[PDB]
Design a protein around this ligand. Structure first.
Ligand SMILES: CCCCCCCCCCCCCCCCCC(=O)OC[C@H](CO[C@@H]1O[C@H](CO[C@H]2O[C@H](CO)[C@H](O)[C@H](O)[C@H]2O)[C@H](O)[C@H](O)[C@H]1O)OC(=O)CCCCCCCCCCCCCCCCC
Ligand code: CLA
Ligand code: CLA
Ligand code: CLA
Ligand code: CLA
Ligand SMILES: CCCCCCCCCCCCCCCCCC(=O)OC[C@H](CO[C@@H]1O[C@H](CO)[C@H](O)[C@H](O)[C@H]1O)OC(=O)CCCCCCCCCCCCCCCCC
Ligand SMILES: CCCCCCCCCCCCCCCCCC(=O)OC[C@H](CO[C@@H]1O[C@H](CO)[C@H](O)[C@H](O)[C@H]1O)OC(=O)CCCCCCCCCCCCCCCCC
Ligand SMILES: CCCCCCCCCCCCCCCC(=O)OC[C@H](COP(=O)(O)OC[C@@H](O)CO)OC(=O)CCCCCCCCCCCCCCC
Ligand SMILES: CC1=C(/C=C/C(C)=C/C=C/C(C)=C/C=C/C=C(C)/C=C/C=C(C)/C=C/C2=C(C)CCCC2(C)C)C(C)(C)CCC1
Ligand SMILES: CC1=C(/C=C/C(C)=C/C=C/C(C)=C/C=C/C=C(C)/C=C/C=C(C)/C=C/C2=C(C)CCCC2(C)C)C(C)(C)CCC1
Ligand SMILES: CC1=C(/C=C/C(C)=C/C=C/C(C)=C/C=C/C=C(C)/C=C/C=C(C)/C=C/C2=C(C)CCCC2(C)C)C(C)(C)CCC1
Ligand SMILES: CCCCCCCS[C@@H]1O[C@H](CO)[C@@H](O)[C@H](O)[C@H]1O
Ligand code: OEX
Ligand SMILES: [Ca+2]
Ligand SMILES: [Cl-]
Ligand SMILES: [Cl-]
Ligand SMILES: [Fe+2]
Ligand SMILES: [Mg+2]
Ligand SMILES: [Mg+2]
Lengths: 172, 81, 504, 34, 40, 342, 30, 37, 57, 65, 39
């Protein structure tokens, strides 16, 4: 639906019907957007950390950059010096092109998998189903957190579109 | 460069593999036996497949007393045999 | 010029104007407290401390006045329900007026300190530059805080020269302001023991006086002066904000869990008293003692105070609210008028049945009745076609003991169900929903609202601490890094110790 | 020319030693039948 | 004295933490003293 | 002057493969134990006595279903110390009671402090401004709000998130059904900061890579950059024209741009945390009172808001008995909310 | 009143877009 | 009195006005539903 | 009537929604994947009942 | 700058800006107090948490009562 | 004896990578057999 609550309705019913949370393409999507957010903050913080002094304390540091200046406005060597020590040297990018490519690729590829998750659950290849996967020596079901998810999903399933189903299976 | 020997030197050296052709399989085998001997179940208190329920019981042994919890778990364990 | 978010930085090297700004903040805060108290007095109904106490009415500052001994109005009432009481000057109204006058005086002092900013006092005699000797200021202020803390404990809380503090019994039935003697044994650290609040103020106060004297008389070590940048007033802001977020988390926690300083007659009961059926257990104890002494069931239930029954109701649980469900608890379920009495459900065989209570997690909850062993005996079904436990099928009746319905029995299924729906909330009350156009939806108490605001502000002040701490320790690079930064200081292995040019 | 036992060596082995023990344990688990 | 089992536990925790921190600092100091930075 | 403190300071700050620092003394043990505890529990430890769940590789769970699960509700907010009154020094019993959960949450909390101290310590040594540490306040606010504050407002640590993939999913669905957390404007601000951050990450990386100056002969263009070069590797002027013409506005100031990249996701996370602090107290954005008044009176009035609450009611009724075993819920078939057929 | 308020805010946002685009401070090279 | 030497001019550029107005208007669009409840 | 069961769902501000509850509601299940332009409806009133704006948008 | 009666009286209390004791001074004594304070906080925390349970110390509303 | 380079890095990578595939494969095998198999 084209609306805020409508969006949430679509999400909850999708979860009931496809167990999207347990689908690796939505998981890649999450890695894509959580990671995009992480790397966004990380890039912003590291460039901001390393801005070259061009201003005084009573002005915004932003005035230290002029639109179209030829010279870079932060010291990437210092930023890399920092980040490479935060983790270890070879985990940090010293190549701006390689960094900015990673910044593009990580969220884009993850979101492509998100999109493909929805587009393939469209044809009902659904999330991993480990319902009753763990059984004891007698055959008693030993729940896992997958079975608890399943109970939540059932709640959604049985209540959604409460007057629309006449037959026992929701086949589309 | 921070002073330590490059990894690529280390892992392409014969002495590294003389050492690690022993230590790596030794550790892997020890982990294997930690499970295969049953020791893991005992150390961590994890039920074996036959030890989730007594034969006719279908009630989870849930801890319900904070300060007697150790004794409750012990009583639950007694009830299995 | 300065960006909008830096305008107040003009005060960093201007002690007189800093004092002025502080004076104006203090005027605003004290004006708030006075105004808030006035609004509360203009809306507060003192006529029923049993079923309409302050915490049902959205009162936020009233309970603070009461905790420390302000319990009466000039109009003649008291929050304990007394009449013809003379509180002297320090009624709720006098406290409010005092705050308003204070506000005015502080506003005027601000004006003076703003105009007359250039005082010699604020200049370093050796350099002529504006300067504050913050380590000695700390000692002076700590000594003062200690005297005051000690005095509060030794005179106010003990009743030696002052009113004491609010205390009550374990079920919040008989609360009043009393003098409290210090507890000097280990139970002094029990949060529910008022005597430890007294001993705290006495002992921490003495410690503060001593440490204050120390901080007046002994200079900081050079090593600490440099490490903490003690010449920079922003280091004090950083550490002060840290202390304040600590204090704010503590007052959030003690409000939520309860303590001797968050009594239930002033702030409402806790969520945990519902979770553990704290009040239900005591009611049952009392009833059983009554039956054992030879009382009838009507008599036994009739002996339960309405105020006790009212705490055993989920509408007073602070974990039943909503963030945008605004106002007093009375706006939701209504203004409580009377206990209906204790409902006893029975089936057609005459077995007592028990309604399963709603946990705080649930906005809605089914109606399920069990026997004493937990076996299901009756419910309200959703699907009817395969129902086996309906009240119709099971001939469920309800009889009331105590309260307005005492001695009455209802057998018609719609009425018995109605009462079962209310029994999920615990004890059943009659409410006035007309007076405030109450909407039937639960709201939290001041215990809830205080805890929310303080936990939130605590967490935000953590960011403040990080920020001002960063500004302090990195003052040299806060307009940017060294334009002449040598690649060698960030090249691996050039220096043995990171950032130490003596170690090439 | 290079030392063997360094902070880096310790850090590597604090992770690597348990990781291999654990992988051996989890391998064995694949053959457990109820 | 009235040392409940949980006070005895508290002391055990306290002692254990002091030992972990004590040994950690003893070892770090020792290494620092053995392996010093070369200076100007 | 040349004492042991200064000598230790020397050693701690040597430029080595893995930097240590004073912060390392806190960070390394705490991080190692949090990670090690997670791996230990997910590999070997049950949740039978606390939740009625299998949760380890040992019991047959996979990477998605393993977890270190919270302690039983009856533990309340016990620190659950190994030497505490519950486990009384017994490591096995401690595992069975959920001691690894508080172990991981508390070593993890101190580890995060250590990591943020490290960010400060390193920044100071290299001579950069400490914005990375400042930015990391967001992850701290999330961890503290969700793993500590949230359960502390609730009955017990039981209701904190269990450390596990499926366990975290269960936590999301719990928040929908019980808190209607999607409806909360603080969560919505969270969403916008995360998705907005992801957007900015993607768009800034792509813009730089597509406005590059030709600084080499290679068709693969990464080698045409030198860390020490003075000049911008891409054209801000061309980037600016492109976006001005495509979208209507564009960045013109690189310092602003990169600050904004900090601000957006950091602010989003901080807003989401504030919401969760309210959820600690069940202080939800659950309902619109105006909607409920209308719907109660008018059985033809339906919105997506009302539809979602029906879903929520299903979630609660269907999940509660197994998800909250300490309540001993028995909900007869006949009381379960269901639509037609399903 | 509610509807008016929502629509008013939206319409202000739309006007803002117009001014932010067509009446921006123009970017100037050095 | 002699003038205070700590005075500084304050600035808000046009872009910052626009950013600020957007923040405030979108916050209002978001929070308004809740305020009406 | 999103679900084709003559159970119309209100999405617009003037019909009782706020910004959060509001929506343009999907076209009817009765329509399915059929193309439902304005000109396939007998009237705009029908077009509206059946969720024609969704498809156009 | 302006002298006043009260400013003159208070002058000595704001005249030692920058003044420090040599080297580490009282830092070790401070460290002892900080450790004792950490332990104090831990004790009160664990009492409130019921991790430390002491005779005569009932952490409940039924404390006194 | 411990001269770097005696075992080429491409061989170390290939063998190590093959080892990772084998152990991960074993883990997928185990999803279909014994505990966790649903059977
Ligand atoms: C910022 C970022 C900085 C970096 C992060 C640093 C992380 C460091 C780690 C700190 C760990 C703190 C653990 C706190 C445990 C706790 O609280 O444990 C809880 C205990 C109280 O115990 C609870 O008490 C409850 C109520 O009991 C009371 O009421 C009952 C019902 O009537 C009975 O009468 C009972 O006897 C009586 O005690 C129940 O019994 C619970 O089961 C029980 O757990 O309080 C206590 O220990 C202490 C309570 C007071 C101080 C709390 C300060 C810290 C917490 C602030 C957040 C508050 C939450 C508000 C939510 C919004
Ligand atoms: C700690 C502060 C605090 C607390 C805990 C309370 C508590 C209470 N007050 Mg009081 N009050 C306060 C401060 C507080 N007050 C202040 C400062 C004033 C002056 C404005 C008042 C004036 C006042 C009045 C006039 C009344 C109350 C009432 C009440 C009660 C109902 C509260 C309610 O419905 O809240 C509702 C709370 C909310 C809806 C939450 C607001 C959340 C905001 C909008 C979030 C802002 C988000 C932000 C814009 C995002 C920025 C994003 C950006 C950084 C990117 C309750 C006991 C009522 C009562 O019952 O009196 C008898 C009442 O009528 N109070
Ligand atoms: C005692 C608490 C306190 C004090 C005295 C200060 C003082 C200062 N801070 Mg800090 N800070 C604090 C807490 C504090 N901070 C907290 C809790 C946070 C996290 C929220 C911050 C985050 C912070 C940042 C990110 C920045 C500052 C900056 C500043 C400086 C300039 C402030 C200015 O011109 O704002 C001018 C502010 C305005 C013109 C309007 C602000 C409107 C707010 C957002 C909404 C309305 C607030 C409302 C009226 C207040 C209600 C009170 C509240 C307690 C409920 C100044 C030294 C700035 C700095 O370092 O400059 C160099 C800076 O960039 N502070
Ligand atoms: C993420 C958390 C964090 C971070 C990164 C910082 C960072 C900073 N703080 Mg702050 N601070 C914090 C939390 C933090 N603080 C907390 C929770 C408090 C208590 C209110 C403080 C109180 C504080 C003060 C008073 C001062 C600082 C200062 C500083 C700065 C210098 C470094 C320092 O003194 O660290 C301090 C060290 C730590 C935060 C680590 C403490 C580790 C403890 C001791 C481990 C305890 C283990 C525990 C006993 C185990 C039992 C647990 C129990 C649950 C069972 C820097 C900006 C100073 C400053 O601003 O200088 C300009 C300053 O004066 N901080
Ligand atoms: C920086 C390192 C560090 C930090 C901050 C922590 C922090 C913590 N650990 Mg961990 N841990 C560590 C390293 C660390 N650990 C290491 C290296 C190991 C392996 C040995 C462990 C193994 C471990 C276990 C097995 C457990 C803990 C637990 C804890 C928690 C409770 C600790 C406590 O109560 O201490 C109390 C002690 C102190 C705070 C020390 C104070 C020292 C003072 C200042 C000196 C006074 C000592 C005094 C003279 C002693 C005399 C007593 C005498 C009268 C009998 C806390 C979160 C517990 C937990 O997580 O439960 C859920 C738990 O069960 N930890
Ligand atoms: C100078 C300029 C001042 C500008 C004022 C601007 C108004 C801004 C709008 C504020 C909206 C908040 C009110 C909600 C709507 C409302 O009507 O409430 C109205 C309520 C009053 O509630 C009313 O009470 C009445 C009887 O008194 C009736 O019962 C009414 O039905 C009931 O609505 O007002 C308040 O309660 C104000 C106090 C709020 C307490 C806040 C708790 C702490 C919140 C901290 C959150 C900080 C998070 C920061 C994140 C970054
Ligand atoms: C030398 C290298 C040192 C570096 C290691 C440093 C430590 C950090 C390591 C983190 C590992 C986290 C993943 C563990 C996965 C695991 O062991 O699964 C082990 C499980 C074991 O497999 C299970 O075993 C059970 C035994 O009773 C049953 O047979 C189950 O049916 C079966 O699934 O394998 C899998 O689930 C297969 C998939 C593994 C893929 C993980 C993808 C991770 C991606 C995100 C990581 C972030
Ligand atoms: C199944 C996954 C399929 C994804 C493949 C595409 C990945 C890269 C595209 C992202 C586009 C971002 C926006 C434009 C960003 C942009 O402008 O980038 C530009 C950047 C550099 O441009 P150049 O001109 O220098 O090089 C590209 C050509 O001109 C050839 O030299 O392109 C690359 O670096 C391409 C790398 C290809 C390497 C082959 C594919 C490698 C797979 C990586 C993914 C692994 C999948 C794991 C899943 C769990
Ligand atoms: C001058 C003078 C005077 C008078 C004075 C007066 C009359 C005063 C008043 C004062 C006042 C009367 C004050 C007030 C104040 C207030 C305030 C200061 C408020 C604030 C507020 C706020 C801050 C808010 C916030 C918020 C909101 C709004 C919403 C929600 C959220 C929050 C809470 C955040 C006299 C005669 C004495 C004489 C002497 C002089
Ligand atoms: C808790 C505790 C403790 C500690 C412990 C520890 C410290 C541990 C550690 C542990 C560890 C440290 C472990 C490890 C493990 C590992 C593992 C288990 C791994 C796995 C992996 C995987 C499986 C992988 C895979 C892959 C690859 C290789 C590549 C890419 C792809 C993939 C991801 C597929 C103590 C004694 C103090 C105390 C008490 C308690
Ligand atoms: C190096 C590297 C790596 C690893 C890798 C790997 C691990 C690989 C593997 C590889 C492989 C391992 C390969 C293989 C291949 C093979 C082939 C290509 C074969 C072919 C064959 C054929 C074609 C056959 C046929 C036939 C038939 C049809 C029938 C019967 C007879 C016969 C059998 C002859 C990594 C990534 C870590 C890092 C980077 C680099
Ligand atoms: C014999 C009367 C049958 C109806 C039973 C009424 C349940 S009790 C009823 O609850 C209402 C809330 O829904 C209150 O506002 C009201 O004061 C109260 O009488
Ligand atoms: O419509 Mn919308 O959701 Ca896809 O599934 Mn079938 O249909 Mn209805 O049900 Mn479930
Ligand atoms: Ca009405
Ligand atoms: Cl639906
Ligand atoms: Cl159907
Ligand atoms: Fe960039
Ligand atoms: Mg078998
Ligand atoms: Mg298996």
């Amino acid at each position: 639906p084209l609306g805020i609550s409508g969006t949430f309705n679509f999400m909850i019913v999708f979860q009931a019907e496809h167990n999207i949370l347990m689908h690796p393409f939505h998981q890649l999507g999450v890695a894509g957007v959580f990671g995009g957010a992480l790397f966004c903050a990380m890039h912003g913080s590291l460039v901001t950390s390393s801005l070259i002094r061009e201003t005084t304390e009573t002005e915004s540091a932003n005035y230290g950059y002029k639109f179209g200046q030829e010279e870079e406005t932060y010291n990437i060597v210092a930023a890399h010096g920092y980040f490479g020590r935060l983790i270890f040297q070879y985990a940090s990018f010293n190549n701006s092109r390689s960094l900015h490519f990673f910044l593009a690729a990580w969220p884009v590829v993850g979101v492509w998998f998100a999109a493909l998750g929805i587009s393939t659950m469209a044809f009902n290849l659904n999330g991993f189903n480990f319902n009753h996967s763990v059984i004891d020596a007698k055959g008693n079901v030993i729940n896992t957190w997958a079975d608890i998810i399943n109970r939540a999903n059932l709640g959604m399933e049985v209540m959604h579109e409460r007057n629309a189903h006449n037959f026992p299976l929701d086949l589309a | 460069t921070t002073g330590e020997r490059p990894f690529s030197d280390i892992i392409t050296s014969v002495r590294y593999w003389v050492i690690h052709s022993i230590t790596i399989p030794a550790l892997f085998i020890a982990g294997w036996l930690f499970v295969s001997t049953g020791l893991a179940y005992d150390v961590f208190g994890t039920p074996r497949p036959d030890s989730y329920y007594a034969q006719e019981q279908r009630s989870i042994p849930l801890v319900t007393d904070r300060f007697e919890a150790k004794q409750q778990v012990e009583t639950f364990l007694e009830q299995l045999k | 010029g300065l960006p909008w978010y830096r305008v107040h930085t003009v005060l960093i090297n201007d002690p007189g104007r800093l004092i002025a700004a502080h004076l104006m903040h203090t005027a605003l805060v004290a004006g708030w407290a006075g105004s808030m108290a006035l609004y509360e007095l203009a809306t507060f109904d003192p006529s029923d401390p049993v079923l309409n106490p302050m915490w049902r009415q959205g009162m936020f500052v009233l309970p603070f006045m009461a905790r420390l001994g302000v319990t009466g109005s000039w109009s003649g009432w008291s929050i304990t329900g007394e009449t013809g009481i003379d509180p002297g000057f320090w009624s709720f109204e006098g406290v409010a007026l005092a705050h308003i006058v204070l506000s005015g005086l502080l506003f005027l002092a601000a004006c003076w300190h703003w105009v007359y900013w250039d005082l010699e006092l604020f200049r370093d005699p050796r350099t002529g530059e504006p300067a504050l000797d913050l380590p000695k200021m700390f000692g002076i202020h700590l000594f003062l805080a200690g005297l005051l803390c000690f005095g509060f404990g030794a005179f106010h809380l003990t009743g030696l020269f002052g009113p004491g503090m609010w205390v009550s019994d374990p079920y919040g039935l008989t609360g009043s302001v009393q003098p409290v003697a210090p507890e000097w044994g280990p139970d002094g650290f029990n949060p529910y023991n008022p005597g430890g609040v007294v001993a705290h103020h006495i002992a921490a106060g003495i410690v503060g006086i001593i440490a204050g004297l120390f901080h007046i008389l002994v200079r900081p070590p050079q090593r600490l002066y440099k490490a903490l940048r003690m010449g920079n007033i922003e280091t004090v802001l950083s550490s002060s904000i840290a202390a304040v977020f600590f204090a704010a988390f503590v007052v959030a926690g003690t409000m939520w869990y309860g303590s001797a300083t968050t009594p239930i007659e002033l702030f409402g009961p806790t969520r945990y008293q519902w979770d553990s059926s704290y009040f239900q257990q005591e009611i049952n104890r009392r009833v059983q003692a009554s039956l054992a002494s030879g009382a009838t069931l009507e008599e036994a239930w009739s002996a339960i105070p309405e105020k006790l029954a009212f705490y055993d109701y989920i509408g007073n649980n602070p974990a039943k609210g909503g963030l945008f469900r605004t106002g007093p608890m009375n706006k939701g379920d209504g203004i409580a008028q009377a206990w209906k009495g204790h409902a006893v459900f029975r089936n057609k065989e005459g077995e007592e049945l028990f309604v399963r209570r709603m946990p705080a997690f649930f906005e809605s909850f089914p109606v399920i009745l069990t026997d004493k062993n937990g076996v299901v005996k009756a419910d309200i079904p959703f699907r009817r076609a395969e129902s086996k436990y309906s009240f119709e099928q099971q001939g469920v009746t309800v009889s009331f003991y105590g309260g307005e319905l005492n001695g009455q029995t209802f057998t018609d299924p719609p009425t018995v169900k109605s009462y079962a729906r209310k029994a999920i909330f615990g004890e059943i009350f009659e409410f006035d929903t007309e007076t405030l156009n109450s909407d039937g939806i639960f709201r939290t108490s001041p215990r809830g609202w205080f805890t929310f605001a303080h936990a939130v502000f605590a967490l935000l002040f953590f960011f403040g601490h990080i920020w001002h701490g960063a500004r302090t320790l990195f003052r040299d690079v806060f307009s940017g890094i060294d334009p002449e930064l040598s690649p060698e200081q960030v090249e691996w292995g050039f220096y043995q110790k990171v950032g130490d040019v003596t170690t090439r | 020319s290079y030392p063997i036992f360094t902070v880096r060596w310790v850090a590597v082995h604090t992770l690597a030693v348990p990781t291999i023990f654990f992988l051996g344990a989890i391998a064995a688990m694949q053959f457990i039948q109820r | 004295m009235t040392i409940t089992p949980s006070l005895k536990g508290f002391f055990i925790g306290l002692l254990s933490g002091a030992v972990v921190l004590g040994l950690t600092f003893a070892v770090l100091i020792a290494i620092s003293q053995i392996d010093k930075v070369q200076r100007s | 002057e040349r004492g042991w403190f200064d000598i230790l300071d020397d050693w701690l700050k040597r430029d080595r493969f893995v930097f240590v620092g004073w912060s390392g003394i806190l960070l390394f043990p705490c991080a190692y134990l949090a990670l090690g505890g997670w791996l230990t529990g997910t590999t070997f430890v049950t949740s039978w006595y606390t939740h009625g769940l299998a949760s380890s590789y040992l019991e047959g769970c996979n990477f998605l279903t393993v977890a270190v699960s919270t302690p039983a509700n009856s533990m309340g907010h016990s620190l659950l110390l190994l030497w505490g009154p519950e486990a009384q020094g017994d490591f096995t019993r401690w595992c069975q009671l959920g001691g690894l959960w508080t172990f991981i949450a508390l070593h993890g909390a101190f580890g995060l402090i250590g990591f943020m101290l490290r960010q400060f310590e390193i920044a100071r040594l290299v001579g950069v401004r400490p914005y990375n540490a400042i930015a990391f306040s967001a992850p701290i606010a999330v961890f503290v709000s969700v793993f500590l504050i949230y359960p502390l407002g609730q009955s017990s640590w039981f209701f904190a998130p269990s450390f596990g993939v499926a366990a975290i999913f269960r936590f999301l669905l719990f928040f929908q059904g019980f808190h209607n957390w999607t409806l909360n404007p603080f969560h919505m601000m969270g969403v916008a900061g995360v998705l907005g951050g992801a957007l900015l990450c993607a768009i800034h990386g792509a813009t730089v890579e597509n406005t590059l100056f030709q600084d080499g002969e290679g068709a693969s263009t990464f080698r045409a950059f030198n860390p020490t070069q003075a000049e911008e590797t891409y054209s801000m002027v061309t980037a600016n024209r492109f976006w001005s013409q495509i979208f209507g506005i564009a960045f013109s100031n690189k310092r602003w741009l990169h600050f904004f990249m900090l601000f957006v996701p950091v602010t989003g996370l901080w807003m989401s945390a504030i919401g969760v602090v309210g959820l600690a107290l069940n202080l939800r954005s659950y309902d619109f009172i105006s909607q409920e008044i209308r719907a109660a009176e008018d059985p033809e009035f339906e919105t997506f808001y009302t539809k979602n609450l029906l879903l929520n009611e299903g979630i609660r009724a269907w999940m509660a008995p197994q998800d909250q075993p300490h309540e001993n819920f028995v909900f007869p078939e006949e009381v379960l909310p269901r639509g037609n057929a399903l | 009143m509610e509807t008016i308020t929502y629509v008013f805010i939206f319409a202000c946002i739309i006007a803002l877009f117009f001014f932010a685009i067509f009446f921006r401070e123009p970017p100037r090279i050095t | 009195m002699e003038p205070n030497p700590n005075r500084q001019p304050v600035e808000l550029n046009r872009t910052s006005l626009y950013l600020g107005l957007l923040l405030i208007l979108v916050l209002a669009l978001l929070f308004s539903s809740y305020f009406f409840n | 009537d999103i679900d084709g069961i003559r159970e119309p769902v209100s999405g617009s501000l003037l019909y009782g929604n706020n910004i959060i509850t509001g929506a343009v509601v999907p076209s009817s299940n009765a329509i399915g994947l059929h193309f439902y332009p304005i000109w396939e409806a007998a009237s705009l009133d029908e077009w509206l009942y059946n969720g024609g704006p969704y498809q156009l948008i | 700058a302006r002298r006043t009666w009260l400013g003159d009286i208070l002058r000595p209390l704001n005249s030692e800006y920058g003044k420090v004791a040599p080297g580490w001074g009282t830092t070790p004594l401070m460290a002892v107090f900080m450790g004792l304070f950490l332990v104090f906080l831990l004790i009160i925390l664990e009492i409130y948490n019921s991790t430390l349970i002491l005779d005569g110390v009932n952490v409940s509303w039924k404390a006194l009562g | 004896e411990s001269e770097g380079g005696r075992i080429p890095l491409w061989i170390v990578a290939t063998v190590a990578g093959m080892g990772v595939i084998v152990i991960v494969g074993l883990f997928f095998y185990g999803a279909y057999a014994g505990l966790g198999s649903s059977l």
